[PDB]
Enzyme design. Structure first.
Site, short mmCIF file in Angstrom:
data_model
loop_
_atom_site.label_atom_id
_atom_site.label_comp_id
_atom_site.label_asym_id
_atom_site.label_seq_id
_atom_site.Cartn_x
_atom_site.Cartn_y
_atom_site.Cartn_z
N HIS A 142 -96.43 -2.04 56.90
CA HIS A 142 -96.14 -0.61 56.94
C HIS A 142 -96.98 0.12 55.90
O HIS A 142 -97.60 1.15 56.19
CB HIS A 142 -94.64 -0.44 56.67
CG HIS A 142 -94.17 0.99 56.60
ND1 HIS A 142 -93.36 1.56 57.56
CD2 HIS A 142 -94.40 1.96 55.69
CE1 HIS A 142 -93.11 2.81 57.23
NE2 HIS A 142 -93.74 3.08 56.11
N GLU A 143 -97.02 -0.41 54.68
CA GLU A 143 -97.77 0.27 53.63
C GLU A 143 -99.26 0.25 53.91
O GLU A 143 -99.94 1.27 53.75
CB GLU A 143 -97.48 -0.36 52.27
CG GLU A 143 -96.00 -0.40 51.87
CD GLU A 143 -95.26 0.89 52.08
OE1 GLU A 143 -95.88 1.96 52.01
OE2 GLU A 143 -94.03 0.82 52.34
N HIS A 146 -100.31 2.81 56.34
CA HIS A 146 -100.51 4.17 55.86
C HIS A 146 -101.96 4.40 55.48
O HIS A 146 -102.50 5.47 55.74
CB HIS A 146 -99.60 4.45 54.66
CG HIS A 146 -98.20 4.82 55.04
ND1 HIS A 146 -97.91 5.82 55.93
CD2 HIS A 146 -97.02 4.33 54.61
CE1 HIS A 146 -96.60 5.93 56.05
NE2 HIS A 146 -96.03 5.04 55.25
N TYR A 157 -98.38 14.31 56.05
CA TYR A 157 -97.11 13.64 55.80
C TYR A 157 -95.93 14.61 55.73
O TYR A 157 -95.19 14.66 54.76
CB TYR A 157 -97.20 12.80 54.54
CG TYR A 157 -96.20 11.67 54.48
CD1 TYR A 157 -96.24 10.65 55.40
CD2 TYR A 157 -95.26 11.61 53.47
CE1 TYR A 157 -95.35 9.60 55.33
CE2 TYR A 157 -94.37 10.56 53.39
CZ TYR A 157 -94.43 9.55 54.32
OH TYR A 157 -93.56 8.51 54.21
N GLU A 166 -95.19 7.95 60.00
CA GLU A 166 -94.19 6.94 59.69
C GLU A 166 -94.03 5.96 60.82
O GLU A 166 -93.97 4.74 60.60
CB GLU A 166 -92.85 7.61 59.37
CG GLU A 166 -92.69 7.91 57.92
CD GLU A 166 -92.83 6.66 57.10
OE1 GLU A 166 -92.13 5.67 57.41
OE2 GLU A 166 -93.69 6.62 56.18
N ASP A 226 -86.80 14.87 53.03
CA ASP A 226 -87.64 13.77 53.50
C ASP A 226 -88.92 14.30 54.15
O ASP A 226 -89.35 13.83 55.20
CB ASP A 226 -86.84 12.87 54.44
CG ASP A 226 -87.62 11.67 54.93
OD1 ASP A 226 -88.42 11.09 54.17
OD2 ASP A 226 -87.38 11.26 56.09
N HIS A 231 -89.10 10.01 57.85
CA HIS A 231 -88.49 8.70 58.06
C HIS A 231 -87.29 8.76 58.98
O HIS A 231 -86.66 7.73 59.22
CB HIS A 231 -88.02 8.08 56.73
CG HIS A 231 -89.13 7.82 55.76
ND1 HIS A 231 -89.52 8.75 54.82
CD2 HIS A 231 -89.92 6.74 55.57
CE1 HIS A 231 -90.51 8.25 54.10
NE2 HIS A 231 -90.78 7.04 54.54
#
Ligand SMILES: CC(C)C[C@H](NP(=O)(O)CNC(=O)OCc1ccccc1)C(=O)N[C@@H](CC1CCCCC1)C(=O)O
Ligand SMILES: [Ca+2]
Ligand SMILES: [Ca+2]
Ligand SMILES: [Ca+2]
Ligand SMILES: [Ca+2]
Ligand SMILES: [Zn+2]
Length: 316
Positions: A142-143, A146, A157, A166, A226, A231
């Site tokens: 996931h990271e 990005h 974002y 996301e 958020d 998310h």
């Protein structure tokens, strides 16, 4: 650092033994020279200055509790690199074999992980909400995804583009988890989330609503928390992706599944050829439809299933 490529051994966050690619020059460093221009893992030493120090170890054995988050950040970055190279012919996050850097032991009790614009960063968790987050291969992927997004579509974002950002990270996090093929699922973060609670996860792609996230555009969050729900509203796209791959009937709309590999091809092409920094959900649908058309033909099942899945989640 300049040195010779070596192979260390250690245990990850979940207690599993694995080999890691290291570099020897006085110390053994978490520097994997076998992939691109290197994968480098750093110790942030419970502080927030980044990256910290390139991880150095005297004996090339990484079995200490303190080592475990570094072992997994390093190893799972390698798996993720392999996924992008082997599956999508993409060389690191920038497509040109940029060095991949991660820091572990970021801050104290830190219940998150992130890409800071230049590197991945993993907290250790507080032992209640999370254990060290690099223990989740879906988290690591996931990271790193990005970074892929930031170098390609550039999805801002916030709001819908941020929820796509996301979801892209959750989708490819999950596809990397399946690629490694150890306890794969369509849940996010289950391996490191809530050690005191079995069977849960931070998000679910198969049923986002299990954790309060929307599974239909009519349930999207429109407030400001958020970053406009990045998310939260990701659940709508995650559900669409899950349906494309696995099929199902959702709010009465039936989707013929086409499998994970085709999902990945369609979304990778959308991400790298059609999405832009401001794409909204409707534009993602169009990008996915066009991508499936490019790959499989306008009359294909794959195109039909992309449309069904976005229909099922209320995205036209
Ligand atoms: C897969 C997850 C295990 C990790 C994932 N991290 P990320 O999306 O990369 C964090 N993104 C972030 O920091 O963007 C901000 C930024 C922008 C620019 C530079 C630097 C940073 C995530 O889903 N995080 C959740 C974790 C919640 C946990 C419960 C308590 C609430 C938090 C969140 O942040 O909402
Ligand atoms: Ca050691
Ligand atoms: Ca899993
Ligand atoms: Ca998972
Ligand atoms: Ca749990
Ligand atoms: Zn994220």
């Amino acid at each position: 650092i300049t040195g010779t490529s070596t192979v260390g051994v250690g245990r990850g966050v979940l207690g599993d033994q694995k080999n890691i690619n290291t570099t020897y020059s006085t110390y053994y460093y978490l520097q994997d020279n076998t992939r691109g221009n290197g994968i480098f893992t750093y110790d942030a030493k419970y502080r927030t200055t980044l990256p910290g120090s390139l991880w150095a170890d005297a004996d090339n054995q990484f079995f200490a509790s303190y080592d475990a988050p570094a072992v997994d950040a390093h190893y799972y970055a390698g798996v993720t690199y392999d996924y992008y190279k082997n599956v999508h012919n993409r060389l690191s996050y920038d497509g040109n074999n940029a060095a991949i850097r991660s820091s572990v032991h970021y801050s104290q009790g830190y219940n998150n992980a992130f890409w800071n614009g230049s590197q991945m960063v993993y907290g250790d968790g507080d032992g209640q909400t999370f254990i060290p987050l690099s223990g989740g291969i879906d988290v690591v992927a996931h990271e790193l995804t990005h970074a892929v997004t930031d170098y390609t579509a550039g999805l801002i974002y916030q709001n819908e583009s941020g929820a796509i950002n996301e979801a892209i990270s959750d989708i490819f996090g999950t596809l990397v988890e399946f690629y490694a093929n150890k306890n794969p699922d369509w849940e996010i973060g289950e391996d490191v989330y809530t050690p005191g609670i079995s069977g849960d996860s931070l998000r679910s792609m198969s049923d986002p609503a299990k954790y309060g996230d929307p599974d239909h555009y009519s349930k999207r969050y429109t407030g400001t928390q958020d970053n406009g729900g990045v998310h939260i509203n990701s659940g709508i796209i995650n559900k669409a992706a899950y349906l494309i791959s696995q099929g199902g009937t959702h709010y009465g709309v039936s989707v013929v599944g086409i499998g994970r590999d085709k999902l990945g091809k369609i979304f990778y092409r959308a991400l790298t050829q059609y999405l832009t920094p401001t794409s909204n959900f409707s534009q993602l649908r169009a990008a996915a439809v066009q991508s499936a058309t490019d790959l499989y033909g306008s009359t294909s099942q794959e195109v039909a299933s992309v449309k069904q899945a976005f229909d099922a989640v209320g995205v036209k």
